[PDB]
Scaffold this motif. Structure first.
Motif, PDB file in Angstrom:
ATOM      1  N   UNK B 262       0.821  -1.198   0.000  1.00 33.18           N
ATOM      2  CA  UNK B 262       0.000   0.000   0.000  1.00 33.18           C
ATOM      3  C   UNK B 262       0.860   1.254   0.000  1.00 33.18           C
ATOM      4  N   UNK B 263       2.175   1.079  -0.004  1.00 28.78           N
ATOM      5  CA  UNK B 263       3.062   2.230  -0.104  1.00 28.78           C
ATOM      6  C   UNK B 263       4.338   1.873  -0.831  1.00 28.78           C
ATOM      7  N   UNK B 264       4.936   2.881  -1.459  1.00 28.31           N
ATOM      8  CA  UNK B 264       6.106   2.708  -2.309  1.00 28.31           C
ATOM      9  C   UNK B 264       7.095   3.812  -2.025  1.00 28.31           C
ATOM     10  N   UNK B 265       8.364   3.547  -2.303  1.00 24.37           N
ATOM     11  CA  UNK B 265       9.384   4.578  -2.230  1.00 24.37           C
ATOM     12  C   UNK B 265      10.687   4.076  -2.814  1.00 24.37           C
ATOM     13  N   UNK B 266      11.266   4.869  -3.700  1.00 20.74           N
ATOM     14  CA  UNK B 266      12.545   4.528  -4.290  1.00 20.74           C
ATOM     15  C   UNK B 266      13.621   5.136  -3.433  1.00 20.74           C
TER      16      UNK B 266
END
Lengths: 291, 288
Positions: B262-266
């Motif tokens: 439900x969450x993403x981050x590079x």
């Protein structure tokens, strides 16, 4: 070596305060005015004396005070703001409404058009700004902080950028105007404070004192002048170089020095050669520039 | 390719938001429905990828989004308690409170200058704040429109200007991200519709179909990729040329409904993808 503003005549026809004046570049012989009598009036300007102008058409529909009005560049269409919390788009020639704008819940205080005629920026008494489509659809609703003034703008529907400039001005009484080239902005404070602000340069310039409670502001479209409607007369300032050009107070033969009407609206001529002022006595007065 | 490298399991609720810092590559920030945020020390070690270092516990409900300053020194969080908090990353204590939203707070960002904060509500209201906690502007677009509010950098507080871009997107479900270089914006609609929009060029590009309800979007800092957290795993699209680079669906054990991201981050260098999950875990892929 100095110029002068000379009282040219007068324009009667309204029953209540003349709250707003509007001018058109495409129609120099056309003036538009709004009033607390719930109407707007279009005027045929002859430039005679003293019947400077004469009513042409009355615009009815507003159920309450009309506070502000404006014309399209061509003079074909008018916009009005009302205390009935509405805005109307008018056919100048036929005097009939083409569009109500409903949605504001505080009295409507100001109106403007983006150059493209595509969208309408309106201003409420509670300081709420709404951006509308010419079709009467509210697209965005913006509300700044009380100790700030703003310049909402629509950059040239699937999409639209709106740039909003905010300027800190503690004493502000929410009485604004933008310079012809929209490069400058004058904001009225308490006790006649008028703060000037450079937008393109992003800093204030100075603060003038019109010395008395300001009701209206209007930059000259030709000269570097700012006219300020005061409870005490209309002050016309030279901006560069700074002097006070003139202090337009009419005689009110019939009034005591205390109960004297005053200007509550201002508007310069497309050629900045004529200054219109709407008054507390239902009358529009007209000055012209001379040498 | 993306390769699952490990896991970070310190939360007791959905990991709702991840945040990364360029100035601090081995630091990760996460927010959760457990009402807390966690700062993480990243080692790159094997499935002990990261280890909890702090535990910001000030909110009284679900923390929905978070973000770090460029330097990693300060964190911002948005909560369902209708508040936002500014945090000292090192000490884990609040330095200012943001009250005024009356709908659940769903998103937070900082203008590069660190001067002001843009926040986003569930009712799609947008509020611009001073770092001192003062709400300066409140903006509310139309429901069928999505918006990227930006604070213009004075370029030289008494004065400040705001450009708000509005984009028509009927089906939109108010899940939104911007390219790092603010040139692009991806907006999620229904049934997995992801509309891409060129800001600098003011027009749509195309609409990517994920075939699965999206929950999160994150563009690549270096490579032209868009990651999308879906109810069935994480899709990573190449934007030029367009293909599905990878579909990251991790390994659960046993033998119906499974935990989803439900969450993403590079990471700042685009080499690592962090994803927060419906099972309180953060998982980590790396590019190989």
């Amino acid at each position: 070596s100095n110029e002068v503003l000379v009282l040219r005549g007068t324009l009667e026809g309204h029953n209540g305060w003349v709250t707003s004046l509007a001018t058109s570049a495409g129609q120099p012989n056309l003036l538009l005015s709004a009033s607390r009598d719930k109407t707007l009036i279009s005027w045929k300007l002859t430039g005679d004396d003293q019947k400077f102008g004469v009513p042409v058409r009355s615009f009815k529909g507003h159920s309450h005070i009309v506070q502000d009005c404006t014309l399209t560049a061509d003079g074909a269409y008018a916009l009005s703001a009302s205390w009935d919390k509405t805005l109307r788009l008018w056919d100048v020639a036929t005097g009939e409404t083409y569009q109500r704008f409903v949605g504001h819940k505080s009295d409507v205080m100001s109106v403007d058009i983006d150059k493209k005629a595509s969208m309408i920026i309106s201003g409420s008494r509670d300081k709420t700004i709404k951006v509308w489509t010419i079709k009467g659809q509210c697209l965005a609703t913006l509300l700044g902080h009380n100790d700030w003034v703003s310049q909402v703008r629509v950059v040239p529907l699937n999409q639209f950028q709106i740039e909003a400039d905010f300027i800190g001005h503690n004493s502000n009484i929410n009485t604004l105007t933008a310079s012809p080239d929209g490069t400058l902005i004058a904001s009225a404070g308490k006790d006649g404070e008028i703060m000037l602000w450079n937008l393109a340069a992003k800093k204030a310039m100075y603060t003038l004192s019109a010395q008395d409670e300001v009701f209206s502001l209007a930059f000259s479209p030709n000269r570097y002048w700012l006219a300020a409607a005061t409870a005490t007369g209309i002050k016309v300032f030279s901006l560069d170089p700074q002097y006070l050009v003139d202090d337009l107070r009419p005689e009110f033969a019939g009034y005591s020095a205390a109960a004297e009407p005053h200007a509550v609206s201002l508007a310069w001529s497309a050629d900045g050669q004529t200054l219109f002022a709407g008054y507390t006595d239902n009358v529009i007065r007209v000055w012209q520039v001379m040498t």
